[PDB]
PDB file of C-alpha atoms and ligand atoms in Angstrom:
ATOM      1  CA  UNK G   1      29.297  31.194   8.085  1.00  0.00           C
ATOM      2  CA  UNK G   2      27.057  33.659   9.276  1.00  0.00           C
ATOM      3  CA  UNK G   3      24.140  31.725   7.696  1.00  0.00           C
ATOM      4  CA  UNK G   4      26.599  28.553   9.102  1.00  0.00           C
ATOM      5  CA  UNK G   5      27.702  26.772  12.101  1.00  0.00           C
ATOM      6  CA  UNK G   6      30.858  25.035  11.856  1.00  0.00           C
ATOM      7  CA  UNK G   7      31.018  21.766  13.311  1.00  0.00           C
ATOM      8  CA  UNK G   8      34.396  20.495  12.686  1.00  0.00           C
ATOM      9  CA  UNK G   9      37.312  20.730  10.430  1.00  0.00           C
ATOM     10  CA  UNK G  10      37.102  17.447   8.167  1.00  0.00           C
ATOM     11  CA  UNK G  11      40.724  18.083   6.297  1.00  0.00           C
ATOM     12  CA  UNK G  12      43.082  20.527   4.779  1.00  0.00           C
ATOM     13  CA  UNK G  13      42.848  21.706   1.531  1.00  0.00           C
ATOM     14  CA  UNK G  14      45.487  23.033  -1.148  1.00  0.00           C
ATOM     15  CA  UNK G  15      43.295  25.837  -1.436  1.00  0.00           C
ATOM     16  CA  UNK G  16      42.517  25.955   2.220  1.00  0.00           C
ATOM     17  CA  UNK G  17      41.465  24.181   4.838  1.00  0.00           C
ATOM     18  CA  UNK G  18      37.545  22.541   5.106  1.00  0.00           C
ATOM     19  CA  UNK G  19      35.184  22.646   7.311  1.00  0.00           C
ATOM     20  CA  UNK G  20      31.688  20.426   7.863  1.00  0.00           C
ATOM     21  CA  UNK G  21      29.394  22.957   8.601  1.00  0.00           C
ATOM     22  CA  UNK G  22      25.719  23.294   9.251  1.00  0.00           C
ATOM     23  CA  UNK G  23      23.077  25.764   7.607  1.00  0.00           C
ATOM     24  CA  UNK G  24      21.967  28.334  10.454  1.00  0.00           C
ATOM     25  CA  UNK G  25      18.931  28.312   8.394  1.00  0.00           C
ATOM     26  CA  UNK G  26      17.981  25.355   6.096  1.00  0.00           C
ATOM     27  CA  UNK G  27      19.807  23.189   8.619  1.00  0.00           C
ATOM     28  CA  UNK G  28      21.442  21.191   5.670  1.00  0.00           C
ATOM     29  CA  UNK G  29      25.008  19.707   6.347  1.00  0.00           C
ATOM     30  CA  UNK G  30      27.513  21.092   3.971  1.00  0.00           C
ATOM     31  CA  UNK G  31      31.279  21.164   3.368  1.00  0.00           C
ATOM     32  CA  UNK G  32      32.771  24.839   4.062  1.00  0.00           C
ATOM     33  CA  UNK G  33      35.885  25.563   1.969  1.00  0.00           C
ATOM     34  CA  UNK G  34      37.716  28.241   3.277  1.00  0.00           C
ATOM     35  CA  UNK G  35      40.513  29.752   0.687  1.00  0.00           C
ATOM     36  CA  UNK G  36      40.298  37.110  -5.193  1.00  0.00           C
ATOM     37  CA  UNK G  37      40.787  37.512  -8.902  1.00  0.00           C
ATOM     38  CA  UNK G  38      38.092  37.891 -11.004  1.00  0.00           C
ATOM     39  CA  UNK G  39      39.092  35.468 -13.202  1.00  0.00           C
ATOM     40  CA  UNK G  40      38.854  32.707 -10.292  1.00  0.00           C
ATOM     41  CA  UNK G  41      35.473  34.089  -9.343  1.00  0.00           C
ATOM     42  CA  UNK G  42      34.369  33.394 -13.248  1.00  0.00           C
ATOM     43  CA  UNK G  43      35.802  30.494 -13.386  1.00  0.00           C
ATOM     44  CA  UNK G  44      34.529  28.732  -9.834  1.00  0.00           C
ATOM     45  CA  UNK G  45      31.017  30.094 -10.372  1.00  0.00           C
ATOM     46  CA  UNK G  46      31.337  28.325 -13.647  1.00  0.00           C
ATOM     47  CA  UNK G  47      31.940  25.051 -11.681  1.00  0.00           C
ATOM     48  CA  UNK G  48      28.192  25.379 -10.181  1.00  0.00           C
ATOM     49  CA  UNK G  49      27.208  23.872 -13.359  1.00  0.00           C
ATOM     50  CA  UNK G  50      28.842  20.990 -13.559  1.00  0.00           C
ATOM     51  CA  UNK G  51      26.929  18.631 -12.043  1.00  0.00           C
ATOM     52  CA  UNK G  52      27.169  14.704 -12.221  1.00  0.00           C
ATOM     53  CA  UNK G  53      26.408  12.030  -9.750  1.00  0.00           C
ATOM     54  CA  UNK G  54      29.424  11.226  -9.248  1.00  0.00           C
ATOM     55  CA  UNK G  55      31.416  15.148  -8.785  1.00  0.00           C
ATOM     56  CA  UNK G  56      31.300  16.425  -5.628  1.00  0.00           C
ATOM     57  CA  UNK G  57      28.247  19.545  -5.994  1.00  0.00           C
ATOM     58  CA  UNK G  58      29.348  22.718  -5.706  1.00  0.00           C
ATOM     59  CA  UNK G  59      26.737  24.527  -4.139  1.00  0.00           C
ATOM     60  CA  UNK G  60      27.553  28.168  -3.783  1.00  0.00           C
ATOM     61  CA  UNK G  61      30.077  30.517  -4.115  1.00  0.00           C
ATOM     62  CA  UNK G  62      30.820  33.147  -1.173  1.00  0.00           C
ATOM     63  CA  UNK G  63      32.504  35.739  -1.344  1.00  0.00           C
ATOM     64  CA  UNK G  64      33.039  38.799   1.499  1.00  0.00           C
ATOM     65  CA  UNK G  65      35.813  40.789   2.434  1.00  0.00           C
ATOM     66  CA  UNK G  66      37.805  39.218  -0.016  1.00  0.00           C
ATOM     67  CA  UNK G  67      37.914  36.007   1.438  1.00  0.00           C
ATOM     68  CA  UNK G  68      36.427  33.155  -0.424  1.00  0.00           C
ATOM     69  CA  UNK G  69      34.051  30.045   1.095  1.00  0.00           C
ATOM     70  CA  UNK G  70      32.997  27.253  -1.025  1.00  0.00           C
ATOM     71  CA  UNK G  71      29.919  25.546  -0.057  1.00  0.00           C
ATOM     72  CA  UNK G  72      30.366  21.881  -1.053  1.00  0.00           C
ATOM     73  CA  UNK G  73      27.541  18.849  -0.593  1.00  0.00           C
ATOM     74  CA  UNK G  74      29.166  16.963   2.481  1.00  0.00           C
ATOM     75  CA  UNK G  75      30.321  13.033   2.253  1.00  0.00           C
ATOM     76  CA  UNK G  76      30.884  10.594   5.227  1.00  0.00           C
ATOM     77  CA  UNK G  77      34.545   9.660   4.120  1.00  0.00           C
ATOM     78  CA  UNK G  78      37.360   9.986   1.608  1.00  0.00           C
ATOM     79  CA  UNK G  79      39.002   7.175   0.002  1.00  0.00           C
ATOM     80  CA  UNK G  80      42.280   8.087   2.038  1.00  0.00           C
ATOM     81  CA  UNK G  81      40.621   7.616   5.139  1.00  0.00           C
ATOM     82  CA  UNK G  82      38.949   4.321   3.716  1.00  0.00           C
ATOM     83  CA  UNK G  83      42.194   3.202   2.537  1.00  0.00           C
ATOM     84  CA  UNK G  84      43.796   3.595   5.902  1.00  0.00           C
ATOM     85  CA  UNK G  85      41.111   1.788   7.135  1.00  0.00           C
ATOM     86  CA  UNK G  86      40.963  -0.707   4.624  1.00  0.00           C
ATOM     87  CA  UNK G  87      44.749  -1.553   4.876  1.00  0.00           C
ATOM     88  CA  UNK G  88      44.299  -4.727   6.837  1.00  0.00           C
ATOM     89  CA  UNK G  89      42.128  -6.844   4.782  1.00  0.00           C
ATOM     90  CA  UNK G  90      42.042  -4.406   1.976  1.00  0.00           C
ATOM     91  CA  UNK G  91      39.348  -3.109  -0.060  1.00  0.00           C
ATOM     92  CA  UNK G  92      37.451  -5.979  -2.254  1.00  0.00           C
ATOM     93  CA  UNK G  93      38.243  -6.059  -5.607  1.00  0.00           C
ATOM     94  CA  UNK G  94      34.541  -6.098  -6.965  1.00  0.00           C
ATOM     95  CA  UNK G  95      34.081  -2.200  -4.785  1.00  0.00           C
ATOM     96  CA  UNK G  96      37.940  -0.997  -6.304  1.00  0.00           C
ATOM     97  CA  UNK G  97      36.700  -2.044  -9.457  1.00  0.00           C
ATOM     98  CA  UNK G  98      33.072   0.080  -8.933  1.00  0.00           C
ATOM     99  CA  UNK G  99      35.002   2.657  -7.551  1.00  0.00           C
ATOM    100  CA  UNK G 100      36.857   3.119 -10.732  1.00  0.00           C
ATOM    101  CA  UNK G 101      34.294   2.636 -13.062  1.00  0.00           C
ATOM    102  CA  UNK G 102      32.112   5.406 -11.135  1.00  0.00           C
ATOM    103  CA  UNK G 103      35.153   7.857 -11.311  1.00  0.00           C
ATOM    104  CA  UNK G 104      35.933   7.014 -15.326  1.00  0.00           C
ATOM    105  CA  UNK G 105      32.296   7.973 -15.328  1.00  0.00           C
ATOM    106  CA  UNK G 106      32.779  11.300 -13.737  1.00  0.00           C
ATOM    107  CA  UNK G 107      35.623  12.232 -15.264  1.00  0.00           C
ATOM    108  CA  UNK G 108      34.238  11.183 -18.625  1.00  0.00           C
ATOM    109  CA  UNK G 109      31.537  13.751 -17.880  1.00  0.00           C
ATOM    110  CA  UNK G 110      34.259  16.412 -16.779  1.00  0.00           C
ATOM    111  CA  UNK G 111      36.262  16.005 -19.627  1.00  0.00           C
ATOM    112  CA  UNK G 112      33.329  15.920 -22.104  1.00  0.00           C
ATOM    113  CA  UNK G 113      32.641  19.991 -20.776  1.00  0.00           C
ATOM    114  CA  UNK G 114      36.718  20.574 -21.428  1.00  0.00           C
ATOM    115  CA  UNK G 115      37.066  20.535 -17.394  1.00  0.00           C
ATOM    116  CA  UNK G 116      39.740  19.359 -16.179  1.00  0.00           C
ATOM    117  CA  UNK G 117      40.508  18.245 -12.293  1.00  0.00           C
ATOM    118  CA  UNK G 118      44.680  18.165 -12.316  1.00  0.00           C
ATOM    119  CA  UNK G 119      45.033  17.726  -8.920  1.00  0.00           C
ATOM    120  CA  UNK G 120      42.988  14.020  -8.537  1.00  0.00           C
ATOM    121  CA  UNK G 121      44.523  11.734  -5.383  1.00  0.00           C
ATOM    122  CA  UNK G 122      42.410   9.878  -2.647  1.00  0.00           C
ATOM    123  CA  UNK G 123      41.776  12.758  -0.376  1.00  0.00           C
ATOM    124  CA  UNK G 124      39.938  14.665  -3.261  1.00  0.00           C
ATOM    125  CA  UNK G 125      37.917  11.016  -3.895  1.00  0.00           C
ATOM    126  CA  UNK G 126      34.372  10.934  -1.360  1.00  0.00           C
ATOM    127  CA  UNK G 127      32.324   8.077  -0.356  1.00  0.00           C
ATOM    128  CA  UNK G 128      29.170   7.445   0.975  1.00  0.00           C
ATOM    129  CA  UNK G 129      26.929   4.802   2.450  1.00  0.00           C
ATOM    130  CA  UNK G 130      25.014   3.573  -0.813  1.00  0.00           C
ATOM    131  CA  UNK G 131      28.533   2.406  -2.673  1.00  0.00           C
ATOM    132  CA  UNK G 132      28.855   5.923  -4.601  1.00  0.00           C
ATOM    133  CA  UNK G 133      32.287   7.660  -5.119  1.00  0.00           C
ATOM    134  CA  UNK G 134      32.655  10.783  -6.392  1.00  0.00           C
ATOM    135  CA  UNK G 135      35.641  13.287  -7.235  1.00  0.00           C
ATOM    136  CA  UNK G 136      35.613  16.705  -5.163  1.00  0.00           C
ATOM    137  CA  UNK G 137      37.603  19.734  -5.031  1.00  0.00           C
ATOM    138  CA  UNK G 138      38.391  20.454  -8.520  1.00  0.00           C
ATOM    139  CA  UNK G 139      41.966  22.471  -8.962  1.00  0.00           C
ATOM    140  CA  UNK G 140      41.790  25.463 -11.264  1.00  0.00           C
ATOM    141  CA  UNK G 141      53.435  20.732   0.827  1.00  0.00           C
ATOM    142  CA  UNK G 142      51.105  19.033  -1.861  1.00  0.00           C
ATOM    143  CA  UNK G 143      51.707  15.759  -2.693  1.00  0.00           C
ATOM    144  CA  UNK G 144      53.515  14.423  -6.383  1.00  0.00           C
ATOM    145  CA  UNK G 145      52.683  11.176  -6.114  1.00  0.00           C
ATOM    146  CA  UNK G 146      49.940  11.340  -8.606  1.00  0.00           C
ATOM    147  CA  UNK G 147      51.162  13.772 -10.744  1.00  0.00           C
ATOM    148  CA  UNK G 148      51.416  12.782 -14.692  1.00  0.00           C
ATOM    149  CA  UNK G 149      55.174  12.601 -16.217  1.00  0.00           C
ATOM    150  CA  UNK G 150      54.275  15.607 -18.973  1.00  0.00           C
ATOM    151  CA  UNK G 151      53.580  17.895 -15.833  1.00  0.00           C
ATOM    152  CA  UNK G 152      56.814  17.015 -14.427  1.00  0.00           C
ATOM    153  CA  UNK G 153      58.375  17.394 -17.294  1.00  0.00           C
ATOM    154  CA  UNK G 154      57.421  20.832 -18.255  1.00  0.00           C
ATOM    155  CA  UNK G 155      54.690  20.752 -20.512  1.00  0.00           C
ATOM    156  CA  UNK G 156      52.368  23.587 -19.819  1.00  0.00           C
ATOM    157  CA  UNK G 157      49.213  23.010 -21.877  1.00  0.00           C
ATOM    158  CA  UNK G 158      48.368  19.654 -20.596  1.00  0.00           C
ATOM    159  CA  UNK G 159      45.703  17.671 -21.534  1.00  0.00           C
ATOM    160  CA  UNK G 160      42.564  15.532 -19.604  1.00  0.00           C
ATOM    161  CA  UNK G 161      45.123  12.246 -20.034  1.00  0.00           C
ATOM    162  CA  UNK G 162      46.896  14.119 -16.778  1.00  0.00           C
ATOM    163  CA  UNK G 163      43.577  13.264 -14.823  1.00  0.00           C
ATOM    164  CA  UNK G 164      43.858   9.507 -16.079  1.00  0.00           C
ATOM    165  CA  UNK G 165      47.129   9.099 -14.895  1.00  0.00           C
ATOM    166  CA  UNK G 166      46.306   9.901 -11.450  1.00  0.00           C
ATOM    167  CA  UNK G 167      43.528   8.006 -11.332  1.00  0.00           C
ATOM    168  CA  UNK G 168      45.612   5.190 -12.964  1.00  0.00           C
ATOM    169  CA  UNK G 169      47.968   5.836  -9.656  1.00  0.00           C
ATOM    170  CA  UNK G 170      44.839   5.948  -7.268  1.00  0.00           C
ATOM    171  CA  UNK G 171      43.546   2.886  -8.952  1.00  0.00           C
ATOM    172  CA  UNK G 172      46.959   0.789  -8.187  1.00  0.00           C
ATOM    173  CA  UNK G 173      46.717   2.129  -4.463  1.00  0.00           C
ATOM    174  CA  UNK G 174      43.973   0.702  -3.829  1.00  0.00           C
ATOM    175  CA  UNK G 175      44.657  -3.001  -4.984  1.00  0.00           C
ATOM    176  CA  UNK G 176      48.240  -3.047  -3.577  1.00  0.00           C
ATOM    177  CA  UNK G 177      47.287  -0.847  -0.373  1.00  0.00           C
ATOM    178  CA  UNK G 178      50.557   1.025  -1.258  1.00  0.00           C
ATOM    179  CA  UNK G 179      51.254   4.034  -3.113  1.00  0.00           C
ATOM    180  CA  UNK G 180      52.369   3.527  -6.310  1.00  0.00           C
ATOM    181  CA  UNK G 181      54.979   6.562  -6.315  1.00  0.00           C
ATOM    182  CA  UNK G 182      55.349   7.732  -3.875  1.00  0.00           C
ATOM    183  CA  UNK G 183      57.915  10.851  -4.557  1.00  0.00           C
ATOM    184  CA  UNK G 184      59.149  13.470  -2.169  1.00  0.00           C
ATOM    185  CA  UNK G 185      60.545  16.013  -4.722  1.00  0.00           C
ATOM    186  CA  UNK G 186      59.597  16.793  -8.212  1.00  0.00           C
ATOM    187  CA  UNK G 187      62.857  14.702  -9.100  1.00  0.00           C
ATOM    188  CA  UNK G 188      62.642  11.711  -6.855  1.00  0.00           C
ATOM    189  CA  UNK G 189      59.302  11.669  -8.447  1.00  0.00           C
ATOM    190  CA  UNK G 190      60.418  11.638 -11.616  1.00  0.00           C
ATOM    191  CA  UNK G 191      62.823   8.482 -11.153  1.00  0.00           C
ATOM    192  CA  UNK G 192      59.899   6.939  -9.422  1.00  0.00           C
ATOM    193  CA  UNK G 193      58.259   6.026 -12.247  1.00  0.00           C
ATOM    194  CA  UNK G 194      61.486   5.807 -14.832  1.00  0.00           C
ATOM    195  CA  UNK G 195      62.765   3.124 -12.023  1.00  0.00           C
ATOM    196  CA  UNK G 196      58.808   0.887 -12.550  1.00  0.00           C
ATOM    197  CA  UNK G 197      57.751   2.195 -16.183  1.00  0.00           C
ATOM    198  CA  UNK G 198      61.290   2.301 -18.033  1.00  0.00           C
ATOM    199  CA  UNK G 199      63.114   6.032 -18.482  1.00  0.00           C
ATOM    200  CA  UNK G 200      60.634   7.075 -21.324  1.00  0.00           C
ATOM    201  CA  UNK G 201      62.802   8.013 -24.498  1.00  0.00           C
ATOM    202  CA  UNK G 202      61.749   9.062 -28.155  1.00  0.00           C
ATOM    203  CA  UNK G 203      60.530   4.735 -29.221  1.00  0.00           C
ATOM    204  CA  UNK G 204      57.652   5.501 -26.866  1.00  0.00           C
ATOM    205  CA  UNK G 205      56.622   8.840 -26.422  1.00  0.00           C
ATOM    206  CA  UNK G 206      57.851  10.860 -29.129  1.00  0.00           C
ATOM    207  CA  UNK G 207      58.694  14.433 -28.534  1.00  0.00           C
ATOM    208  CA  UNK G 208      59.624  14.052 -24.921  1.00  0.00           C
ATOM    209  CA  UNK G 209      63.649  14.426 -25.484  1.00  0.00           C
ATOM    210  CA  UNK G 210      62.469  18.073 -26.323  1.00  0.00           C
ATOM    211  CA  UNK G 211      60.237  18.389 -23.865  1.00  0.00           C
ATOM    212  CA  UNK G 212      61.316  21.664 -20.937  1.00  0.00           C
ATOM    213  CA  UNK G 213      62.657  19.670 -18.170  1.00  0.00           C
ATOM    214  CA  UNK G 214      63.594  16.687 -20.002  1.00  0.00           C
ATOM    215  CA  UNK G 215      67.395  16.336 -19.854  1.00  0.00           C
ATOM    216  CA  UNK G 216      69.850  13.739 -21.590  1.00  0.00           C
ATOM    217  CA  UNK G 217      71.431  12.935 -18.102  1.00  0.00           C
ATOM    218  CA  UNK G 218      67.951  11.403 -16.614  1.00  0.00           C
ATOM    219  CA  UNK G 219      69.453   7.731 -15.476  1.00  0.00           C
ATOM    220  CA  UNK G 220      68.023   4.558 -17.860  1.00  0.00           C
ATOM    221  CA  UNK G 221      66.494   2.351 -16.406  1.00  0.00           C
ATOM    222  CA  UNK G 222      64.572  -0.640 -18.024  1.00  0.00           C
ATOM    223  CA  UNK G 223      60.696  -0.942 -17.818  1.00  0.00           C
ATOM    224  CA  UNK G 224      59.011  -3.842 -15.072  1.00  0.00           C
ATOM    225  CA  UNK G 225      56.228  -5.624 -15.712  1.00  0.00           C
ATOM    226  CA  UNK G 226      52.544  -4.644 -14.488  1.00  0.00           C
ATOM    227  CA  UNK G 227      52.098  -8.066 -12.609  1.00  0.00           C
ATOM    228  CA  UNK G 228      55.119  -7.052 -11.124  1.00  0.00           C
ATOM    229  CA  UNK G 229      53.972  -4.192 -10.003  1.00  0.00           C
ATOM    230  CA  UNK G 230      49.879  -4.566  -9.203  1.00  0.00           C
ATOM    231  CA  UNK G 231      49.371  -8.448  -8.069  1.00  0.00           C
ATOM    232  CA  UNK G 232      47.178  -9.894  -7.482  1.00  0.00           C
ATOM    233  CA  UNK G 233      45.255  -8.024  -9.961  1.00  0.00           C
ATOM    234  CA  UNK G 234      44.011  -9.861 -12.836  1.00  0.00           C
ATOM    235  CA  UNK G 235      45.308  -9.892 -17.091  1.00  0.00           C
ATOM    236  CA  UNK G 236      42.095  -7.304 -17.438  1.00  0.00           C
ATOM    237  CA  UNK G 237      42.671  -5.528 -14.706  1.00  0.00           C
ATOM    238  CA  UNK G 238      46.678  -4.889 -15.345  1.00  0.00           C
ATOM    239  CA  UNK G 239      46.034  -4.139 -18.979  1.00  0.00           C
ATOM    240  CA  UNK G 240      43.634  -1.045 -18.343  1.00  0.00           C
ATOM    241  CA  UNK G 241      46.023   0.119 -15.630  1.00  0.00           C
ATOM    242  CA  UNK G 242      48.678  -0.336 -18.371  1.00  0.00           C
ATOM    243  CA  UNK G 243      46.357   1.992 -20.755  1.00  0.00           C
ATOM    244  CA  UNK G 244      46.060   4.300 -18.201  1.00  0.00           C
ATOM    245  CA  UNK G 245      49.939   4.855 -17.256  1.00  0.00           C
ATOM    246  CA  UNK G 246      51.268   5.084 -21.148  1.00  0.00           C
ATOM    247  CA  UNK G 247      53.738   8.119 -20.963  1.00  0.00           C
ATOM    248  CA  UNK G 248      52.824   9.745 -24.285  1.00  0.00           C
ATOM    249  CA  UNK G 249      49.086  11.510 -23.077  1.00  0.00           C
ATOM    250  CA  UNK G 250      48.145  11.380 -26.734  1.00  0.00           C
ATOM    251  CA  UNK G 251      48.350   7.514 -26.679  1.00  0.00           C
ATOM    252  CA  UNK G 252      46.798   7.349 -22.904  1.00  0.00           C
ATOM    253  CA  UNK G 253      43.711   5.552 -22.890  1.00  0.00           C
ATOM    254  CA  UNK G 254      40.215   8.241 -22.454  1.00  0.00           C
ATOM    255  CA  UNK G 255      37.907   7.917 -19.856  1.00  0.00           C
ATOM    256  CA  UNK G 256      35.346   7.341 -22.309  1.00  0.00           C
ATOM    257  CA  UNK G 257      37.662   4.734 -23.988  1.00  0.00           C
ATOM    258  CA  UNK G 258      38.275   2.836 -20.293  1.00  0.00           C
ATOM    259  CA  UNK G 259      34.385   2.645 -19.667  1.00  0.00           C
ATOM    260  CA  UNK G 260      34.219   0.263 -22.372  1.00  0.00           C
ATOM    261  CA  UNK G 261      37.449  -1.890 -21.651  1.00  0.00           C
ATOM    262  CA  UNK G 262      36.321  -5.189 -20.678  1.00  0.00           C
ATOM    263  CA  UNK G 263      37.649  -5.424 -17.296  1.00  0.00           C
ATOM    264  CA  UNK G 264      34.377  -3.587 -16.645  1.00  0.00           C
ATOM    265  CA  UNK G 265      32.231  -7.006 -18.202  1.00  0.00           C
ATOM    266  CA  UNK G 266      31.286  -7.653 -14.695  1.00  0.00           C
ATOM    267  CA  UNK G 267      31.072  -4.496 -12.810  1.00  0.00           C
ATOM    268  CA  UNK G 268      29.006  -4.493  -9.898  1.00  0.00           C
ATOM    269  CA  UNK G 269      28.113  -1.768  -7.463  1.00  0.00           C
ATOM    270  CA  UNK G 270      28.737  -3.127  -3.773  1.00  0.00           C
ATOM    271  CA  UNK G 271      28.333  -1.795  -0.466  1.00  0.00           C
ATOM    272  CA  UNK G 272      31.690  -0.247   1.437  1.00  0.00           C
ATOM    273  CA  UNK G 273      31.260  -0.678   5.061  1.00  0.00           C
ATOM    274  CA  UNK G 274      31.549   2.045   6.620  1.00  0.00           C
ATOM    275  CA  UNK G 275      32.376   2.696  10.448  1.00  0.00           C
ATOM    276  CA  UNK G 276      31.341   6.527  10.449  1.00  0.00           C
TER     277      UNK G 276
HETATM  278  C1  SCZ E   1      41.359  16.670   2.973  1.00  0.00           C
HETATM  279  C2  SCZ E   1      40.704  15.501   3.392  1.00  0.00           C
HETATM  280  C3  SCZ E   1      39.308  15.394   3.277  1.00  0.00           C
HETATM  281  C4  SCZ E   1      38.573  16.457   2.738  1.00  0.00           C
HETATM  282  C5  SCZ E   1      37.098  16.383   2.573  1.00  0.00           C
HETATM  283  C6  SCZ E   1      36.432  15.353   3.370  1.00  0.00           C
HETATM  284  C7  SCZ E   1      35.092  15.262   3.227  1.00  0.00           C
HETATM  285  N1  SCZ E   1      34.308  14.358   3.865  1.00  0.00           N
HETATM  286  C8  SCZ E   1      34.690  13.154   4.579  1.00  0.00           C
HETATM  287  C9  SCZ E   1      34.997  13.407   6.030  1.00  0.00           C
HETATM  288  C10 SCZ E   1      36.295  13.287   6.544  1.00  0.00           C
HETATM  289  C11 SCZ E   1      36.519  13.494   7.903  1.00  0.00           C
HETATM  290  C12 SCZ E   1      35.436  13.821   8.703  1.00  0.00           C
HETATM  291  N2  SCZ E   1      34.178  13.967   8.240  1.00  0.00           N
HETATM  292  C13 SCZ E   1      33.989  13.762   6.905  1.00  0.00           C
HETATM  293  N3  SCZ E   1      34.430  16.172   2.370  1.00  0.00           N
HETATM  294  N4  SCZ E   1      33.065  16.253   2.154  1.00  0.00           N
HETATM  295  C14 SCZ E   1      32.935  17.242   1.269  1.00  0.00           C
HETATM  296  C15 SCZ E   1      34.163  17.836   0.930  1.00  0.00           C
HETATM  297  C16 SCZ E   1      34.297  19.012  -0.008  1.00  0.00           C
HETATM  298  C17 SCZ E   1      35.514  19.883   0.040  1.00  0.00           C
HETATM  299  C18 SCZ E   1      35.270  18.986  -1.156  1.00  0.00           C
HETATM  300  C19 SCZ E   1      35.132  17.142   1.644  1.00  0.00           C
HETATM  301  N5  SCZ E   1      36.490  17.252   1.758  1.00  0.00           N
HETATM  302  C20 SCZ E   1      39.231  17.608   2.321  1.00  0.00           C
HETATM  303  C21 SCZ E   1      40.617  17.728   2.456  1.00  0.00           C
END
């Protein structure tokens, strides 16, 4: 950044890779994206106002000799990193369960403005000292492992339910400190969650024998139980994640919906700690 100093490179985008950088100038610590149509330049300067405690601010747009930096407010960790770091003891459930509520709350917000994220898993998820989460990087090797069914399966004007899936996915990570499919083609994928949700057919999500990439051949397998698949979490706990990973997206709870599910009755906001 000629008006920035890079300090180091915090992670690899989709997009590009991402830098923490410093402001030659102002002096302010930022996030330096580093990825152009006009219809992307429309569209990301768009993003600058959508603002909500808990997104990720987007704080300007640069664009010279064709190459494209996105200057992003910076964040002490990402929920992967956490996670890793986590994975001994685990994260508590009272934070997982702030943690989700803050994220329903910024998503709620997203969706409300017909914005959608589509590419939600714990790298794009930032924390900081004072408990917050937020989601970064909005879309417009990857991993699959938090990708909804209907985008697997073909459908091409997808919906905000995609977003709730992943975060459904990102939500079961983080109680079980394993992922919850973890695919490594769009296929294996796929069978991932047939093999844990039950191959979905036409009794629960209509429409989907007709669907692109649905085909007659997929294997059927049976559905397993949620306290199968997410102890120790609790009856309230399973039943939103339940909500949140029902195949047919019209049927998949909202994010407004999930705010007022009553596994948040006692939501709290505690401290992570943080070793930065
Ligand atoms: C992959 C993984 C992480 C990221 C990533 C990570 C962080 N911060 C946490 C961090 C992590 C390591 C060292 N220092 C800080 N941030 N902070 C703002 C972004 C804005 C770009 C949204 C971002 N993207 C990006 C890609």
């Amino acid at each position: 950044m000629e008006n920035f100093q890079k300090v180091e490179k915090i992670g690899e985008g989709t997009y590009g890779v991402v830098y923490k950088a410093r402001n030659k100038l102002t002096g302010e610590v930022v996030a330096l994206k580093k990825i152009v149509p006009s219809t992307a330049i429309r569209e990301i300067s768009l993003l600058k106002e959508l603002n909500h405690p808990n997104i990720v601010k987007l704080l300007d747009v640069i664009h010279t000799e064709n190459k494209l930096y996105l200057v992003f407010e910076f964040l002490h960790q990402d929920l992967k990193k956490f996670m890793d770091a986590s994975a001994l003891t685990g994260i508590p459930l009272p934070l997982i369960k702030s943690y989700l509520f803050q994220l329903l709350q910024g998503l709620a917000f997203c969706h409300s403005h017909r914005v959608l994220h589509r590419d939600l898993k714990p790298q794009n998820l930032l924390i900081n000292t004072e408990g917050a989460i937020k989601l970064a990087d909005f879309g417009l090797v990857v991993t699959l492992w938090y990708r909804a069914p209907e985008i697997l399966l073909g459908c091409k004007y997808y919906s905000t339910a995609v977003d709730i899936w992943s975060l459904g996915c990102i939500f079961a990570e983080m109680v079980t400190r394993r992922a919850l499919f973890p695919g490594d083609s769009e296929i294996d994928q796929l069978f991932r969650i047939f093999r844990t949700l039950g191959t979905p057919d036409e009794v629960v999500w209509p429409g989907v024998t007709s669907m692109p990439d649905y085909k007659p051949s997929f294997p059927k397998w049976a559905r397993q139980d949620f306290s199968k698949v997410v102890p120790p979490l609790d009856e309230d706990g399973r039943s939103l994640l339940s909500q949140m990973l029902h195949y047919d997206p019209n049927k998949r709870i909202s994010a407004k919906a999930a705010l007022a599910h009553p596994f948040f009755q006692d939501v709290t906001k505690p401290v992570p700690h943080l070793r930065l």
